[PDB]
Amino acid sequence: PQITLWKRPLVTIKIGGQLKEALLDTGADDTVIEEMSLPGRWKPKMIGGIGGFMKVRQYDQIIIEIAGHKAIGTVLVGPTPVNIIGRNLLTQIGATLNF
Amino acid sequence: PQITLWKRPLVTIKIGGQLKEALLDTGADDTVIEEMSLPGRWKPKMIGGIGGFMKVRQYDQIIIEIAGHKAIGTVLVGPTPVNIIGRNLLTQIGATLNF
Ligand SMILES: CC(C)CN(C[C@@H](O)[C@H](Cc1ccccc1)NC(=O)O[C@H]1CO[C@H]2OCC[C@H]21)S(=O)(=O)c1ccc(N)cc1
Ligand SMILES: [Cl-]
Ligand SMILES: [Cl-]
Ligand SMILES: [Cl-]
Numbered sequence: 001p002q003i004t005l006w007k008r009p010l011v012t013i014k015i016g017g018q019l020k021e022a023l024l025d026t027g028a029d030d031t032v033i034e035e036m037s038l039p040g041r042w043k044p045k046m047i048g049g050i051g052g053f054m055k056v057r058q059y060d061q062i063i064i065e066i067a068g069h070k071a072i073g074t075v076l077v078g079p080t081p082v083n084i085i086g087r088n089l090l091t092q093i094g095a096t097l098n099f
Numbered sequence: 100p101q102i103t104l105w106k107r108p109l110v111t112i113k114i115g116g117q118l119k120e121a122l123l124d125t126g127a128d129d130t131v132i133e134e135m136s137l138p139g140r141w142k143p144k145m146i147g148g149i150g151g152f153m154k155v156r157q158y159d160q161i162i163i164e165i166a167g168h169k170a171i172g173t174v175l176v177g178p179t180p181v182n183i184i185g186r187n188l189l190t191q192i193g194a195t196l197n198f
Binding site for chain 1: 124168180194195
């Protein structure tokens, strides 16, 4: 698809068996999802942005379906106000910015 | 161009006669640049990011070149960790997300 940017670029994702809405975010290095359980090991991380930093849990090798396209990678989980699909998974679905 | 996302999508911008680096950020509603002098009056604005809220100065109808494309629109100025080009100006340069 081609997604214009008049509105926030939100898509449906499936993660951990759950359907969620998420923002396709070229400014995010990594994917950050609201608090939820994920299987396996995790380690703490701090991510910084507008407003300062947020503490998250980093889960590796998590499969996400993003608008119907499967991808695997690191997912950070924390009290983000918006689910964000970052570059680490955008690359995997072949996403590009075009102008 | 067609910009892939294996690295940060950084571009050169020109604002107030100065060249700066900025991140093309589809997850940003607004364009936010580090402290600098701009002409005219400004208005208050609060934006919310990953670490919480941030006060900024809102300047309207500012001339800015983004990767060689001319835009004229709102620029928020504040203590952001990186200059970010948000959807308000990405739409002006005709940018879309594609996969
Ligand atoms: C600021 C960027 C360098 C990094 N951010 C991604 C960015 O797209 C956020 C993504 C975002 C979006 C909504 C809420 C929190 C974070 N947008 C953002 O802060 O935009 C602000 C300016 O326009 C406004 O519109 C959205 C809030 C305002 S971030 O959310 O802090 C972040 C940083 C690191 C990772 N791995 C993941 C996300
Ligand atoms: Cl990854
Ligand atoms: Cl590629
Ligand atoms: Cl604008």
